Each structure stands twice: as structure tokens, then as C-alpha cells.
């Protein structure tokens, strides 16, 4: 059981500073070394910084020299990064990863990965979402195994989680790519194919959660 609890994402104005943190639980955090890697939307993965094991040798990315501060605390087994960025493209998803050598065998490749934290640098702020029910429309097809969904329009930023039966239903769910609107507000539809005989038997409520705006909407989907 190796857990990498990560936090520190958000949306800020260019030139802001943020506090990335991920704590490793379930192994000898001090014995091994961590590493960092970021990914832009639709782009590959690039190394950011390193701390080694005893913090005796510290490596920074050439492109981001003198911009990020990396530290670790073995007292409570966590890893911190003071991120000071003056550039907008740094908007990306970050990952803190673990190595395989005991302390440092020969340089640092990756062994484990986190979930990735979202960082956005833009002048725009957070905006509330809009919910629209894509009703279950068998129409031509007879009753049974119809597709129903809910669409989040004019929201920012990613993500929004849409769940059915108050989160009990997850199989057969298609989450379409977040279409980029003119204003930049994200928009995506979640559609699940479920039998229509259970439309009047099990209540269908698409719960849409937007953590950056903390907006929760439980839109009802009735048989039709």
C-alpha cells in the first residue's frame, strides 16, 4: 500500500505563487528519493526538479532555473514545492513520482506515479456551470437499453464529475472530451446506456460536481 496524497492545484493570475505538496505514506520515504514531472495538455512529459535522498545534491530544470523551490520533510513524510511562475504556459498537470534504487544507485528513473494536480495560469477566473439533461431518447428503438446523460456547459475549469444513482452507477459511462468554447469555458457531456425498464424503477439523478467552483447540481432524469 503506497499512497501519494497530492494537493496544490488551482487557477491563478500570471506571476502568482502556489504551494504544491504530496505526502508519501506506506514506505520508507526518507530512504528513497522522489522526482517531479509535468505534462501540458496534449504534450509529453518533462522533468522539473529533484531532491535526491539526503538533499545533498539538488537538480533543477534548465528552462525553469531559479523559479521553483523544492523541499522535503521526513518528520511528517511529505514533499513540498514553492512554485513561483511568471509564465502562462506553465498551465499543466504535475506528478510526483518515486524511484526504484535504495538511495541512489545510478540517477533517477520512475517507478510509481501519482494522480496529477491541475495548475492554470490565466487572467480568467472561476465561473459557475450550467446543467442540461440529454434525455433518454430511445425514440426509434423500443424500450430497453436507452442512452441518457447530462451536459455541463459554460464551466471553468476542469473537472466536473457526473454520477448516476448518486454515484452507484459507473459502468457504460462515456465522458466526451471537454469542448473548447469561444469564451474558453469548458463543456462536456456524460452519457450512460442503461435499460429503460429501470427508468421508472430506479431513480436516475445525475450529480454534477465542480470542485473549483464547488457547485453541486443533482439534475433529475425522468423516463420519456
Amino acid at each position: 500500500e503506497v499512497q501519494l496524497v497530492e494537493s496544490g492545484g488551482g487557477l491563478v493570475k500570471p506571476g502568482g505563487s502556489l504551494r504544491l505538496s504530496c505526502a508519501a505514506s506506506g514506505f520508507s520515504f526518507s530512504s528513497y528519493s522522489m522526482n517531479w514531472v509535468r505534462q501540458a495538455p496534449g504534450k509529453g512529459l518533462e522533468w522539473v526538479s529533484s531532491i535526491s535522498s539526503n538533499s545533498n545534491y539538488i537538480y533543477y530544470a534548465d528552462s525553469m532555473k531559479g523559479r521553483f523551490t523544492i523541499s522535503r520533510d521526513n518528520a511528517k513524510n511529505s514533499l513540498y514545492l514553492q512554485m513561483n511562475s511568471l509564465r502562462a504556459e506553465d498551465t499543466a498537470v504535475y506528478y510526483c513520482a518515486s524511484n526504484r534504487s535504495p538511495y541512489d544507485s545510478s540517477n533517477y528513473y520512475f517507478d510509481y506515479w501519482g494522480q496529477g494536480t491541475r495548475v492554470t495560469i490565466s487572467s480568467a477566473s472561476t465561473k459557475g456551470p450550467s446543467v442540461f439533461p440529454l434525455a433518454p431518447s430511445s425514440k426509434s428503438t423500443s424500450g430497453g437499453t436507452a442512452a441518457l446523460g447530462c451536459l455541463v456547459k459554460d464551466y471553468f475549469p476542469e473537472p466536473v464529475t457526473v454520477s448516476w444513482n448518486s454515484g452507484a452507477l459507473t459502468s457504460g459511462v462515456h465522458t466526451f472530451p471537454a469542448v473548447l468554447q469561444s469564451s474558453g469555458l469548458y463543456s462536456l457531456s456524460s452519457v450512460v446506456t442503461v435499460p429503460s425498464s429501470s427508468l421508472g424503477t430506479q431513480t436516475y439523478i445525475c450529480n454534477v460536481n465542480h470542485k473549483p467552483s464547488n457547485t453541486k447540481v443533482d439534475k433529475r432524469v425522468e423516463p420519456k
Binding site: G44, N107, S137, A147
Partner: peptide
């Protein structure tokens, strides 16, 4: 990815896919 002396550098990346039989879609309108 190489691993020698430069801190790190990844390649372009390759995505794989499968050539299989043709399939027909289902059309929904709302």
C-alpha cells in the same frame, strides 16, 4: 527515454491501435 547524464528528456511518444473489422454506429437525436 535515455538515462545517462542529462537530468531527463522524453521522446515524442508512440500511440498504438488495432486494425479490425468495420462496425456500424447507432444514431441518436435529441
Amino acid at each position: 527515454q535515455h538515462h545517462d547524464s542529462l537530468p531527463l528528456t522524453f521522446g515524442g511518444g508512440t500511440k498504438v491501435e488495432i486494425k479490425r473489422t468495420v462496425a456500424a454506429p447507432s444514431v441518436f437525436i435529441f
